[PDB]
Amino acid sequence: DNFNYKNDTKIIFGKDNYSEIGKNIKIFSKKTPKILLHYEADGELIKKLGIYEKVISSLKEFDIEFIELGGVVPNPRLSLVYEGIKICKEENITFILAVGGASVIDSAKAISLGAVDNGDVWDFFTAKRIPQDTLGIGVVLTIPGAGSEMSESSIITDENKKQKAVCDTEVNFPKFAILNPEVCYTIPDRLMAAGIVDILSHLMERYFTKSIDTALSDSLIEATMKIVIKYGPLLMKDRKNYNYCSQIMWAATMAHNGMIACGRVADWASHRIEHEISGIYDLTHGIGMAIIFPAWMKYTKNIRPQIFEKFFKEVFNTVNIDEGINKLEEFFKSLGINLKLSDYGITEEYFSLMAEKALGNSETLGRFMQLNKQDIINILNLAK
Amino acid sequence: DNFNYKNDTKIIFGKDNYSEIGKNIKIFSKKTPKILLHYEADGELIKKLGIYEKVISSLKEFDIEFIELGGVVPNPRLSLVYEGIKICKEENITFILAVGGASVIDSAKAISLGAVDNGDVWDFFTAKRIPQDTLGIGVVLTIPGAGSEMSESSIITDENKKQKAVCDTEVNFPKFAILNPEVCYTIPDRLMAAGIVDILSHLMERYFTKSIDTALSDSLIEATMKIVIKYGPLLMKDRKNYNYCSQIMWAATMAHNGMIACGRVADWASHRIEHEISGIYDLTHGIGMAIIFPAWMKYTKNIRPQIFEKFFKEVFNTVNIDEGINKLEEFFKSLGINLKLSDYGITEEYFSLMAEKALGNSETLGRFMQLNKQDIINILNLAK
Ligand SMILES: Nc1ncnc2c1ncn2[C@@H]1O[C@H](COP(=O)(O)OP(=O)(O)O)[C@@H](O)[C@H]1O
Ligand SMILES: Nc1ncnc2c1ncn2[C@@H]1O[C@H](COP(=O)(O)OP(=O)(O)O)[C@@H](O)[C@H]1O
Numbered sequence: 001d002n003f004n005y006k007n008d009t010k011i012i013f014g015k016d017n018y019s020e021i022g023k024n025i026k027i028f029s030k031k032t033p034k035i036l037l038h039y040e041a042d043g044e045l046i047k048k049l050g051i052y053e054k055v056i057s058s059l060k061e062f063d064i065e066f067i068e069l070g071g072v073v074p075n076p077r078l079s080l081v082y083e084g085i086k087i088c089k090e091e092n093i094t095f096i097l098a099v100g101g102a103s104v105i106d107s108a109k110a111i112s113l114g115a116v117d118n119g120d121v122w123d124f125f126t127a128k129r130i131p132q133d134t135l136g137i138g139v140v141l142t143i144p145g146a147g148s149e150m151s152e153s154s155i156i157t158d159e160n161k162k163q164k165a166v167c168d169t170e171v172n173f174p175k176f177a178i179l180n181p182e183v184c185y186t187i188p189d190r191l192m193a194a195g196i197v198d199i200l201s202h203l204m205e206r207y208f209t210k211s212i213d214t215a216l217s218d219s220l221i222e223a224t225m226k227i228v229i230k231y232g233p234l235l236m237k238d239r240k241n242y243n244y245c246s247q248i249m250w251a252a253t254m255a256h257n258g259m260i261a262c263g264r265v266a267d268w269a270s271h272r273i274e275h276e277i278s279g280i281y282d283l284t285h286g287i288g289m290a291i292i293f294p295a296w297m298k299y300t301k302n303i304r305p306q307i308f309e310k311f312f313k314e315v316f317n318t319v320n321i322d323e324g325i326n327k328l329e330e331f332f333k334s335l336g337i338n339l340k341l342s343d344y345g346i347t348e349e350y351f352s353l354m355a356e357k358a359l360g361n362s363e364t365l366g367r368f369m370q371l372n373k374q375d376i377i378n379i380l381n382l383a384k
Numbered sequence: 385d386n387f388n389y390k391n392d393t394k395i396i397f398g399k400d401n402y403s404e405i406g407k408n409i410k411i412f413s414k415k416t417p418k419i420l421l422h423y424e425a426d427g428e429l430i431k432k433l434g435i436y437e438k439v440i441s442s443l444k445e446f447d448i449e450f451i452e453l454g455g456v457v458p459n460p461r462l463s464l465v466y467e468g469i470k471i472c473k474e475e476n477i478t479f480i481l482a483v484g485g486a487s488v489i490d491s492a493k494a495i496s497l498g499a500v501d502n503g504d505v506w507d508f509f510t511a512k513r514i515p516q517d518t519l520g521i522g523v524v525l526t527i528p529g530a531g532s533e534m535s536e537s538s539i540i541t542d543e544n545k546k547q548k549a550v551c552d553t554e555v556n557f558p559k560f561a562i563l564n565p566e567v568c569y570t571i572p573d574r575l576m577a578a579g580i581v582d583i584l585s586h587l588m589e590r591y592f593t594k595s596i597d598t599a600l601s602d603s604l605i606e607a608t609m610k611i612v613i614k615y616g617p618l619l620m621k622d623r624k625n626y627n628y629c630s631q632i633m634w635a636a637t638m639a640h641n642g643m644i645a646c647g648r649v650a651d652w653a654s655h656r657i658e659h660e661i662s663g664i665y666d667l668t669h670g671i672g673m674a675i676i677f678p679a680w681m682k683y684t685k686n687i688r689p690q691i692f693e694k695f696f697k698e699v700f701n702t703v704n705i706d707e708g709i710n711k712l713e714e715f716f717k718s719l720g721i722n723l724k725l726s727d728y729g730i731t732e733e734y735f736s737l738m739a740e741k742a743l744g745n746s747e748t749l750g751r752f753m754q755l756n757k758q759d760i761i762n763i764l765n766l767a768k
């Protein structure tokens with residue numbers, strides 16, 4: 001149970017600090033800076049929220065020239081990376097400012113790769129060549145989900161082949177990421193609640209593990225989880241509260257940190273099951289992770305019951321798995337979330353279809369518990 | 385209460401992995417690698433422990449040429465950095481492997497600065513010039529104290545001026561740090577116990593703070609502290625237990641991480657008081673941090689009692705400060721440590737002298753509580 005850890009992304013955390021955009025562009029861009037401002041669509045949100053302008057007022061404040069590129073799709077297209085690469089070689093862009101969420105942060109990362117490369121950028125997603133440099137990006141995050149602002153991955157889709165892929169390498173690490181919890185305020189309720197689940201789930205998938213000798217790390221993952229459990233409901237009912245937003249945003253960041261999860265095997269079973277509820281139904285990840293995970297832990301409560309007893313003792317102050325599973329259920333409902341799939345008029349109709357697609361060509365699925373097709377149907381019946 | 389965080393030092397954590405020395409030298413040294421092996425004195429310990437050879441067997445395993453430099457003093461001298469710089473320009477050393485503890489890790493860092501600089505290296509400790517590059521170092525840590533293996537500081541002393549100084553900049557960050565808990569085994573008892581106190585103390589100095597809105601971070605610092613409290617005594621009585629050593633070593637690393645302490649004001653009062661007990665008496669830091677801190681928290685128990693109630697609830701499972709201060713006292717004794725200065729035949733003789741030297745030219749000392757000369761004498765009388 002050894003492990004390595006790197007993460008060089010600079011964290012600029014806090015509020016009323018919009019100068020550090022400029023400052024940090026100067027610090028990690030060569031020569032004189034000239035940047036690309038990247039965002040989903042035509043600035044429609046970042047502008048409506050007032051980030052756009054205060055962004056611009058930072059660049060002006062620092063004599064930073066800049067072209068803009070827009071038109072990002074929620075799952076972004078190499079269509080537009082080929083666009084942005086042309087522009088960074090054409091206009092000698094020396095640095096890119098991702099303003100938005102993970103799917104512009106993703107597109108930004110892939111432009112930063114090709115801006116510096118001689119060949120085609122797919123070869124870096126194709127598993128053909130391993131990029132050895134990028135220009136470098138700074139992110140201004142508007143929504144604390146998934147942590148692409150601090151990761152080494154980029155998730156793009158080739159729509160004319162519509163084969164999607166990813167590229168995972170230490171070059172993709174942002175040079176810096178601005179994190180202001182104020183951006184949490186304008187987020188809609190059901191989307192805020194699902195992002196609080198994503199954080200807890202990210203933590204639980206690493207926590208529930210067959211690994212041993214993990215006490216310290218157990219403690220840290222417990223601490224973050226417990227904070228998500230305490231504050232998530234408060235933020236839900238006090239959306240503009242900077243403190244509440246700071247604990248939550250900071251929790252999501254730490255959840256994405258391999259210092260606290262350090263040499264322990266993550267189980268992705270709940271993720272994959274949910275992936276296929278979301279493939280056939282219009283349903284938000286986080287909401288599906290609140291209906292499935294309790295189903296899954298109910299079905300896996302016999303593998304290492306001790307590590308379940310521990311979980312619920314540390315986090316819900318109780319040694320009975322049943323009582324604690326229900327407290328976790330109750331905590332999900334305290335963020336607006338109905339706990340069953342029937343409640344979303346999802347029926348048993350495609351449980352079979354979903355279970356086959358989840359397993360694909362494998363026979364089982366999972367690490368904590370190896371789960372086969374009928375196992376998965378049982379879990380879906382538990383969550384019905 | 386905003387904050388920034390960077391740390392690019394690569395963590396290689398674990399056991400039976402001595403190849404990664406070689407591997408990681410290849411990865412972060414230009415061209416073909418040729419390195420400097422740096423250590424205290426003439427390899428006397430690292431060799432006696434068998435690190436020396438398994439080091440060499442990694443470099444041979446990787447066709448890595450290398451000169452050696454030895455002769456480090458516990459508080460190291462620019463005498464020898466001027467030596468090692470000459471050799472890295474002379475023999476085109478492209479990378480340095482610090483094998484040892486913080487005072488060779490320190491000397492290594494200062495050689496890495498000058499190897500790449502045109503002028504004198506003092507100017508980087510003098511506050512005259514701000515270095516903009518180093519060659520780069522890898523550390524193999526033999527003792528988990530102070531965390532210089534992951535810091536940006538280097539503490540050298542000019543003995544012919546015998547003015548000591550430091551240089552703190554993002555270039556000093558090791559490229560990688562090998563951390564194998566096995567190195568804990570051979571450490572002597574009183575020195576292992578004091579290093580367990582250094583870790584707890586490092587955490588407590590950041591915990592006890594006038595800052596607010598720090599719940600998540602409170603939780604993480606509690607988690608680590610609580611682990612140091614649970615495992616430290618076990619490691620003390622089972623010195624070769626890899627699990628126990630892994631939690632403790634990993635705790636010290638995290639204690640040195642500004643993700644868990646994030647935008648909170650550290651109080652250095654206990655450090656400074658202890659510094660002057662150690663200036664006049666032969667006494668190990670960690671042991672003096674176990675006699676002074678309880679004295680100090682007794683004397684500061686009225687500032688924000690709530691944050692004391694919290695501390696002892698989360699860490700010693702009790703809401704009474706007195707009961708908990710005594711549990712912390714008892715925990716110190718459970719590692720071999722007598723709790724009073726009288727027990728070391730330290731008398732009240734220089735309490736006055738020590739209090740004046742601690743304050744220097746300032747009138748008070750501290751952030752949690754402003755402590756004046758008599759205040760400090762009171763704390764020393766509490767610890768007598
Ligand atoms: N600060 C914010 N306030 C309100 N809505 C936001 C904010 N950030 C993102 N969104 C919205 O959330 C939806 C999906 O999130 P997205 O921005 O694609 O990134 P992620 O992939 O990290 O969730 C988008 O339609 C966008 O409208
Ligand atoms: N793995 C180890 N086993 C035994 N003794 C050690 C080990 N590492 C360091 N020491 C000893 O500890 C003493 C002081 O620690 P030092 O190595 O100077 O670094 P640090 O400054 O981090 O404590 C030295 O005299 C050395 O003999």
Ligand SMILES: [Fe+3]
Pocket residue numbers: 201202205271
């Ligand atoms: Fe997930």
Ligand SMILES: [Fe+3]
Pocket residue numbers: 585586589655
């Ligand atoms: Fe200290």
